[PDB]
Amino acid sequence: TFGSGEADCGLRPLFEKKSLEDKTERELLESYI
Amino acid sequence: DFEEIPEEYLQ
Amino acid sequence: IVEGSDAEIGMSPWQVMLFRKSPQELLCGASLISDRWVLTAAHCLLYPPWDKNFTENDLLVRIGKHSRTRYERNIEKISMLEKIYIHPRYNWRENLDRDIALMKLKKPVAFSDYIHPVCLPDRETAASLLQAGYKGRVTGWGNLKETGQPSVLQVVNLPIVERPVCKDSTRIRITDNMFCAGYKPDEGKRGDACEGDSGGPFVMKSPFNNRWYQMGIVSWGEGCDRDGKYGFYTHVFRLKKWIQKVIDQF
Ligand SMILES: C[C@H]1CCCC[C@H]1Oc1cccc(-c2nc3cc(C(N)=[NH2+])c(F)cc3[nH]2)c1[O-]
Ligand SMILES: [Ca+2]
Ligand code: NA
Numbered sequence: 066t067f068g069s070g071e072a073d074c075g076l077r078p079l080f081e082k083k084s085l086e087d088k089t090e091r092e093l094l095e096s097y098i
Numbered sequence: 099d100f101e102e103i104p105e106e107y108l109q
Numbered sequence: 110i111v112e113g114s115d116a117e118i119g120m121s122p123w124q125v126m127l128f129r130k131s132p133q134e135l136l137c138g139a140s141l142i143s144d145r146w147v148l149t150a151a152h153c154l155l156y157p158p159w160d161k162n163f164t165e166n167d168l169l170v171r172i173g174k175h176s177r178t179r180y181e182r183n184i185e186k187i188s189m190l191e192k193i194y195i196h197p198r199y200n201w202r203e204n205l206d207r208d209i210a211l212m213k214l215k216k217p218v219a220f221s222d223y224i225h226p227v228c229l230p231d232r233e234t235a236a237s238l239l240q241a242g243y244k245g246r247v248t249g250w251g252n253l254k255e256t257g258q259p260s261v262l263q264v265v266n267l268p269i270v271e272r273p274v275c276k277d278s279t280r281i282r283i284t285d286n287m288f289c290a291g292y293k294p295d296e297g298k299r300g301d302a303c304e305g306d307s308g309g310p311f312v313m314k315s316p317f318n319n320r321w322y323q324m325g326i327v328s329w330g331e332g333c334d335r336d337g338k339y340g341f342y343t344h345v346f347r348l349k350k351w352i353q354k355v356i357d358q359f
Binding site for chain 3: 075089093
Binding site: 099100102103107108109 | 178
């Protein structure tokens with residue numbers, strides 16, 4: 066249930082699930098130092 | 099400018 | 110979204126569109142957190158100052174979209190609402206403090222490559238990610254300029270700003286239930302959410318487990334992308350107990 070959410074929440078079919086990155090997510094990851 | 103949707107969704 | 114780009118297909122599978130049946134118009138953005146629950150900003154549904162008070166029957170929720178105006182046959186799903194719950198202490202009189210609402214759908218939706226829920230944060234994730242300097246992402250079909258609307262979903266990545274800076278950019282009283290984000294005038298980069306984007310998600314990607322979490326809801330701003338100004342978002346983690354409660358009560 067929540068805590069996280071629907072268990073498989075936040076993993077995108079077209080990206081995470083296929084190990085593909087979208088064009089600007091790296092920007093985010095890089096800002097976390 | 100919104101295209102119409104299936105009448106069925108208004109009800 | 111101002112100074113943002115077109116999203117990629119399936120980039121934000123949790124993005125929802127609140128659609129009005131008569132007139133048929135985009136009302137606000139929203140997010141899919143379950144197969145039966147949508148999360149939005151309470152001011153998109155109830156805002157007495159302008160005489161706005163929408164009920165179940167006046168809205169439609171459209172999930173799986175990319176194009177703003179077209180009925181994407183075989184891709185998006187349109188659900189009707191069963192119930193709407195507004196936070197009991199939503200403050201429309203003064204600063205839109207606790208600007209959150211939950212909508213229960215008539216039937217569960219099925220996930221697809223374009224429809225998938227977002228995760229809600231937990232204390233630890235909020236703690237480690239909600240730090241000034243860290244960037245989040247906002248999406249929506251809202252205005253492209255303060256003073257038109259895009260053909261597809263737009264996206265922009267913005268840094269979280271130090272609370273002092275947020276408070277010193279406005280006259281409004283900021284509470285612990287909001288945070289602000291955006292670039293400072295001496296940063297070069299621009300970007301902000303705008304009218305039409307209200308209700309949608311501000312999300313971050315955890316570098317620990319690779320999941321996307323929704324940290325904020327687009328709440329308000331003064332103008333769109335003005336220098337010295339920032340966008341304010343509802344702090345989802347601080348209101349989580351309310352979320353859990355209605356979802357495990359209804
Ligand atoms: C669509 C109706 C629904 C009922 C009452 C609110 C009204 O919505 C709105 C009407 C006019 C402006 C906005 C709006 N401006 C906004 C500006 C910003 C920003 N960061 N600069 C934002 F995040 C959300 C906004 N939302 C807005 O959300
Ligand atoms: Ca890890
Ligand atoms: Na700004």
